[model samples]
Target: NLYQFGRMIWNRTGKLPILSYGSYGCYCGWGGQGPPKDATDRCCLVHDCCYTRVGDCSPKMTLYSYRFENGDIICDNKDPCKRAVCECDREAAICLGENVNTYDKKYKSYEDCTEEVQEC
Candidate 1:
């Protein structure tokens, strides 16, 4: 969640205040948590708009990922924004701590996986 953390740090400063959002500019994060990742593709720059000049660019090249409310990490092309900033309701724990529905994928909370939203 470094992107989330980085976004937190950036929030301390101010908004991007120029372009809406792109590769090198600033874009708001999920529920004010931080900038989005591959999951929020709809909200972020596209593969065409996010092509890397140096080569590979995940800096804005979404990874297309998401987290489950119960802490299970499943891959279904489900919109990342829906849960990108979902609230945990208790402890603010990202994962439900259960190992269900992972499909042996080694659960990862994603980049904008991030924190944190309203009440679960």
Candidate 2:
């Protein structure tokens, strides 16, 4: 049902821009609709979502792990530092809410990593 809602938004907007914002950045709520918390392997049980840091670096390296019925989108949030492991969609780019072009690493735009579910 939630995916449906997201689809609705995507359809109406033509394309959903993958917003990247650290837990401290604006629209950080995109991680979920709630207050921000310390970086940890925590899941938003209410929304079936989880986010955690993936590397050991200052500013606390991390990535968001969102669960979907079909697949998920793991957004990287390391300001000014692009991920070497992942490639940016390039076509789907957005200036993070923060006016600063090179400071907000907490949120990075990306394509959706979707996998179809095959009935077994």
Candidate 3:
């Protein structure tokens, strides 16, 4: 998966930073505490997990906003830690980009994951 690629780069650097934990569908720091809201949000789930996998890197460094809109992932920081964080987000953006055609404007939660619904 994309996250594994991010993890590969992160582990190779040998520098890890502790970041706050996040849940599914949570954008950077705020969202429902369950499954992702939609297919687009599922990209975020991989992103959040990728960050955590890479030594708990903070989401604040890489805001989810406007990433898909911009059509690229930019990690300006040269520092190894921040770079790894950015890579996580980059991998996630790749996911969002791939799924852009299938994305929709809707808000759902884990509670909604059961009733003829799904995540990812």
Best by lDDT: 3
Candidates in descending lDDT order = 3, 1, 2
Candidate lDDT values, in order: 0.27, 0.27, 0.47
Worst 10 residues of 3 by lDDT: 12-21
lDDT of 2 by residue, 42-79 (tens): 11111112112313322123222222333333334354
Q: Report the C-alpha displacement of residue 59, candidate 3, in angstroms.
A: 3.3
lDDT (0-100) at residue 100 of candidate 1? 18
Query: After superposing candidate 3, which stretches have Cα over 4 Å from the reference?
Result: 1-32, 54-57, 62-78, 108-120
lDDT of 1: 0.27
**Candidate 2 residue pairs that clash:** 20-107, 20-108, 21-107, 53-62, 77-105, 77-106, 78-105, 79-105
Location of the lowest summed lDDT over 10 successive residues in candidate 2 = 89-98
- C-alpha RMSD of candidate 2: 16.7
Q: How high is each candidate's TM-score?
A: 0.16, 0.19, 0.47
Write the residue-wise lDDT of candidate 1 on 1-113 in tens digits: 22442342223223331122223211122223333333322222222222222133232333443334453333344554322322111111111112112211121223344
Q: Which prediction has the highest TM-score against the true structure?
A: 3
- For model 1 the TM-score comes to 0.16
